[PDB]
């Protein structure tokens, strides 16, 4: 009866296991490269909510490239980088981590 707060939680179900705190994610900021399940898993949890990838795992670069393109400091290399970063892997949840890592580990 009237939630008021309206707890959404981007990873309400992903928290059951993929509850990667601000530890390994922060490491992504630096060129250290850290392998972790909750990390890659948590990412997909945001991708599905962000409105990029579908419940089936179909990558949508047309929407990703446009996002990084429109309003940016140097929008032009993202589109090409999207192809190399959005490489279709054996699973959809995998490619997710590539989005929040590849673009972050891009040489200037």
Automatic annotation (TrEMBL):
Superkingdom of the organism of origin: Eukaryota
Any S-S bridges, and between which cysteines?
14-45, 85-102
Q: Where is this region: Disordered?
A: 4-35
Quote the cellular component terms of the Gene Ontology held in the record: extracellular space
Instruction: Kindly indicate whether the keyword Membrane belongs to this entry.
Output: no
GO BP terms, alphabetized = sensory perception of smell
Is Kinase there in the keyword field? no
**Which SMART domains does the entry mention?**
PhBP
Q: Where is the composition biased (Basic and acidic residues)?
A: 4-15, 24-35
Keyword entries, A-Z: Glycoprotein, Secreted, Signal
Q: Annotated Gene Ontology MF terms?
A: odorant binding
Compartments annotated for it: namely: Secreted
| Entries under InterPro entries matching the protein | PBP/GOBP, PBP_GOBP_sf
Q: CDD domains this protein is in?
A: PBP_GOBP
Concerning Gene3D superfamilies, the annotation shows: Pheromone/general odorant binding protein domain (1.10.238.20)
Q: What does this protein do?
A: May be a carrier protein for lipids.
- Spell out the family assignment given in the record's similarity comment: Belongs to the PBP/GOBP family.
Protein name as annotated? 12 kDa hemolymph protein
Q: What organism does the record attribute this protein to?
A: Tenebrio molitor (Yellow mealworm beetle)
Taxonomic classification: Eukaryota, Metazoa, Ecdysozoa, Arthropoda, Hexapoda
């Amino acid at each position: 009866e009237t939630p008021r707060e309206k707890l959404k939680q981007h990873s309400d179900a992903c928290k059951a296991e993929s509850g990667v705190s601000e530890e390994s994610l922060n490491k992504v900021r630096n060129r250290e490269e850290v392998d972790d399940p909750k990390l890659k898993e948590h990412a997909f949890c945001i991708l599905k909510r962000a409105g990029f990838i579908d419940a089936s795992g179909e990558f949508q670069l047309d929407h990703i490239k446009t996002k990084f393109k429109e309003n940016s400091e140097h929008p032009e290399k993202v589109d090409d980088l999207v192809a190399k970063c959005a490489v279709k892997k054996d699973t959809p949840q995998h490619s997710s981590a590539d989005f929040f890592k590849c673009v972050h580990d891009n040489r200037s």
